[PDB]
């Protein structure tokens, strides 16, 4: 199936069924984070999805086509994390992003903590566009987790 939406990424090389990550399907392309699949091919029922583009430093990978998600956080408004935790139902969480300040510029960051198998969950603006993926970040002083709003480049 190539239906638009958010998907769990599952494996069976370990015990039982394990969720290694999450991804979004849009315009026939599956978008997830590189560390989730390590570029491996994916199964979709009877079909197969092969990697098309990826970059380890960006920690992004796309399947069946080029990266399609190009919406960006405006730097002002609150966003929603559509978290897909392993073994739990998808649930939206609204939040005001922080900032990752690097030498190459600033990127939005969401301060929400979830199991690592939630990596790849989409982050949305109020219009419903995917502005980035959740699951690559840091651990701060208190011990909580802060993830960047990781977005690719279309075309």
């Amino acid at each position: 199936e190539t239906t638009d939406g958010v998907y769990r990424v599952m494996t069976r090389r370990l015990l039982g069924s394990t969720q290694v990550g999450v991804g979004v399907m849009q315009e026939g392309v599956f978008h997830t984070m590189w560390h989730v699949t390590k570029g491996a091919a994916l199964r979709s029922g009877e079909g197969r999805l092969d990697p098309y583009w990826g970059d380890v430093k960006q920690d992004l990978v796309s399947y069946c086509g080029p990266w399609k998600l190009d919406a960006a956080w405006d730097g002002l408004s609150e966003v929603q994390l559509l978290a897909v935790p392993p073994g739990e139902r998808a649930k939206n969480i609204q939040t005001l992003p922080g900032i990752f300040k690097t030498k190459d510029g600033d990127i939005g960051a969401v301060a929400l903590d979830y199991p690592a198998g939630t990596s790849g969950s989409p982050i949305l603006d109020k219009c419903g566009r995917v502005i980035g993926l959740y699951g690559n970040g840091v651990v701060i002083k208190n011990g909580s987790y802060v993830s960047a709003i990781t977005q690719g480049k279309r075309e």
Binding site: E1, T3, D4, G5, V6, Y7, R8, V9, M10, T11, R12, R13, V20, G23, V24, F30, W34, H35, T37, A41, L42, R43, S44, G45, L49, V56, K57, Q58, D59, Q80, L82, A90, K91, N92, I93, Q94, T95, L96, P97, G98, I99, F100, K101, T102, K103, D104, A109, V110, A111, L112, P122, L124, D125, G128, N136, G137, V138, I140, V146, A148
Partner: protein, 38 residues
């Protein structure tokens, strides 16, 4: 082998829980794609 299964629609929820802070962090991104605090 990894496989995927659908988990929901990509949509904004008006009744969504609002939580989480908005910290300003100085970070560095290495060649391996791992962030670190500065």
């Amino acid at each position: 082998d990894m496989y995927i299964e659908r988990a929901g629609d990509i949509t904004w929820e008006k009744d969504a829980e609002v939580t989480g802070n908005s910290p300003r962090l100085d970070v560095a991104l290495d060649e391996s794609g791992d962030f670190s605090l500065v």
